Amino acid sequence: MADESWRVPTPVQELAAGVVEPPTQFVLQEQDRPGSGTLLFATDMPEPIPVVDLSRLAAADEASKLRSALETWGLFLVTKHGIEASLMDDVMAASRDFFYQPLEAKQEYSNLIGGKRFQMEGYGNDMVKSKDQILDWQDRLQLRVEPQDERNLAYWPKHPDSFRDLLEKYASKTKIVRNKVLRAMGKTLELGEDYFISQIGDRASAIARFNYYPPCPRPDLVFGIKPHSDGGAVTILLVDKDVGGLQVQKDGVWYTVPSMPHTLLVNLGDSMEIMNNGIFKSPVHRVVTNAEKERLSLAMFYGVEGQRVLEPALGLLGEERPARYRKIMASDYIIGLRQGGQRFIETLKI
């Protein structure tokens, strides 16, 4: 009937080889470009830089840093998070080893069912919904890590042969970090330390996303990953070798997210914004490319169980305090998120 072979994009790592212009499907309209047309993409983030010593989170001055960071930016760097540098280095080395393999080897894990049907899990790109869609300058391998009995290990790279063990160990380590952050948030919001852990639920999704950003000859014309907020409750992000690129939006201004060696980045998701009545909000963020080197990151997305109603916590609505978000089942929120200027969560504000 009709040819829709534009739904099947070639990996950017291939398209980026040796080019001096970005192919047209990556080029943003002038007013949408990182510097809107200029070479100045972002402002340096002002002090105090949002940094949280996770081992000292029970101390009041550290809790005050976490609260200040979440109010101001919706994210923070974490130090002393309990994840050994050797394991952070190895999981990102395993990722680099996978992306460096031949296209043939990587497409054995393709997220294009039968070579044509997008699904989220596997190696490739995000869904192409229309011919005129501007694509991001990245590829990604995305894997469902939790619940354990829902994993499809056929999409997990078999080479290098320690990829699976490294990801499993790392994910179990980021779950500890997740819970420590969530307990500190329940405490500062006076909701109980286990409030958000229980809202999220024992079988909640945890998804690993290994991002690969090839060098781009014209970083002013494309996004490595387009402006967005994460949809779940909390994201724990690891950037290999702290290569720059990540930026965060605040009051319409884009700020470079600074790096610290051996740290992780925690950012809130939209589901958390609703659950906490907007006290802390989900930050809009993006990745700009560079001309010199590839950039690798690993995001651990912690979602909320699908049938949980997302709604402002009851403890935040005492004393006739008004709800600022309509309620919505978590699976319904994700569905609305994947629909096509205005972010979906704006439709829920009251």
Between 188 and 256, CB nearer to ligand AKG? 256
Give the whole-angstrom CA distance, residue 266 versus residue 130.
32
Half-sphere exposure of 181 (CA within 13 A, CB side): 32
- Tell me what percent of the chain is helix, strand and coil, each rounded to the nearest 5: 30, 20, 45
220 binds, among ligand AKG, Co ion, none (CB under 5 to 8 A by kind): none
Tokens (6 digits) for 204: 């909640």
Residue 213 is assigned to a ligand binding site: yes
Residue 211 is assigned to a ligand binding site: yes
Between 195 and 212, CB nearer to Co ion? 212
CB of 99 to ligand AKG, least distance (A): 13
- Residue 273 found at the interface with Co ion (CB under 5 A): no
CB of 319 to Co ion, least distance (A): 35
Give the whole-angstrom CA distance, residue 250 versus residue 238.
22
How many of the other CB atoms lie within 10 Å of CB of 197?
Answer: 17
CB of 287 to ligand AKG, least distance (A): 5
Residue nearest to ligand AKG (CB): 297
- Residue 136 found at the interface with Co ion (CB under 5 A): no
Tokens (6 digits) for 133: 């869609």
CB of 238 to ligand AKG, least distance (A): 9
Interface positions with ligand AKG (CB under 6 A): 209, 211, 225, 230, 237, 239, 246, 285, 287, 297, 299
Between 83 and 299, CB nearer to ligand AKG? 299
Between 220 and 230, CB nearer to Co ion? 230
Tokens (6 digits) for 61: 């001055």
How many of the other CB atoms lie within 10 Å of CB of 323?
Answer: 15
Which stretch of DSSP H or E encloses residue 172? helix 163-188
208 binds, among ligand AKG, Co ion, none (CB under 5 to 8 A by kind): none
Give the whole-angstrom CA distance, residue 155 versus residue 142.
9
Total residues found in the chain within this entry: 350
Between 191 and 206, CB nearer to Co ion? 206
Tokens (6 digits) for 84: 């050994």
Give the whole-angstrom CA distance, residue 255 versus residue 75.
12
CB of 257 to ligand AKG, least distance (A): 8
CB of 118 to ligand AKG, least distance (A): 17
* Backbone φ and ψ of 330, nearest 5°: -60, -40
Among 90, 139, 220, 230, binds Co ion (CB under 5 A): 230
Give the whole-angstrom CA distance, residue 224 versus residue 216.
9
- Residue 126 found at the interface with Co ion (CB under 5 A): no
- Residue 139 found at the interface with Co ion (CB under 5 A): no
Q: What residues form the annotated binding site for 2-oxoglutarate? A: 211, 213, 295, 297
Residues in contact with Co ion by CB under 5 A are 230
